[PDB]
Every structure is written in C-alpha cells, then in structure tokens.
Amino acid sequence: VNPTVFFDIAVDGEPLGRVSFELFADKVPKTAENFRALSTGEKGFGYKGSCFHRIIPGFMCQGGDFTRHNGTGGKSIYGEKFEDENFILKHTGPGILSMANAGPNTNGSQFFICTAKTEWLDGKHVVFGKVKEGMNIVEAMERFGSRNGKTSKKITIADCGQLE
Ligand SMILES: CCOC(=O)CNC(=O)NCc1ccc(N)cc1
C-alpha cells in the first residue's frame, strides 16, 4: 500500500492549492521513504517552507533544496547523499516525480515534477512517485517559471505531510 504525501503550495505567501503524490515504495522503497520522511518532517527537517527554485514551462518543476534554496544543496534522511536505488521506473509523462542529482549516486532531497514526457532522463534520475491529485496546481506553478528556470514570484511548500 503505497504512501501518499501532500504539498500545499503558496505563490508569494498566498495559497495556490494542494498537490498530492503516490510514492512507489513497492518498487523504490529507500527513495520513497526519504521523500515521505522529508514531507512529514519527522526527522527534524524536510520540505516544509522550502522553495521551488527552478520551474521551466513545458519541462518540469524542481525543488526540495531546503538548505541552500537555489539548487546547490539539500540532504537525505540517510546522510548528505545516497545511491541511485534503481532505474526500474521511467519518465513516462506529466506528473512523474523523480530525484534531481549532480551525477551518479548524488541524491539528497531535491526532486522534480515532470510537466511533459522526459524519456531521456531514464537510467539517469530515479523515478519514485507520481502526481495523484492537483496536477492543475503543478500547471499553475509552471506559469511562474521561465525559460531559464528563474521564478517570477516565490513558490513555496507552505505545508506538507502524509495523507496515507
Ligand atoms: C531535471 C532535473 O534536473 C536536475 O536534476 C539538474 N541537476 C541539478 O539541479 N543538480 C543540483 C543538485 C545538487 C545536489 C543534489 N543533491 C541534487 C541536485
């Protein structure tokens, strides 16, 4: 029974809506657990109040850099970084949740949500969940991002946690 987690998104402090995700703990357990734990904040840190630093319309929404807020940071529940667990699952379309990284076996906390099929990232980024509800809210986030990823307003995870 795969976990469900939610993000409540704010544009410049003002509520936008809720995105929920199924985490594929059945296929990517170690990676699902890191995201589930960081969403609930139960280990004393996580996504709550963190930034979506890079939004590229037609491509993806990236965030989860809760230590440097700009794409150069983050940390896992297992230490600063952890392995690519496997590459069983693929970037099949919009809504796919996948780990960002800075090379092989460099996963921390940064993740991205796909707004298109991104097949080329297969074997390179670990897919561990997908958007369950509120894809329309990820599409609304998309509209504050730019060609180079810089957001026009501050997009944040106002609140996050587990639903199931
Ligand atoms: C479509 C996803 O595009 C990327 O992942 C581009 N990489 C990227 O921003 N890397 C910065 C980074 C630094 C440290 C950790 N732990 C994770 C990521």
Author numbering: 2 to 165
Reproduce the article's own wording on this structure.
Cyclophilins are peptidyl-prolyl cis/trans isomerases (PPIase) that catalyse the interconversion of the two energetically preferred conformers (cis and trans) of the planar peptide bond preceding an internal proline residue. CypD is localized in the matrix of the mitochondria and acts as a key regulator of the opening of the mitochondrial permeability transition pore (mPTP), which plays a major role in calcium efflux from mitochondria to the cytosol and can lead to mitochondrial swelling and cell death. Cyclophilins adopt an eight-stranded anti-parallel P-barrel structure. Their PPIase catalytic groove is formed by a mixture of hydrophobic, aromatic and polar residues, including Arg55, Phe60, Met61, Gln63, Asn102, Phe113, Trp121, Leu122 and His126. The existence of a deep pocket contiguous to the canonical catalytic site, called the ‘gatekeeper' pocket, has been revealed.
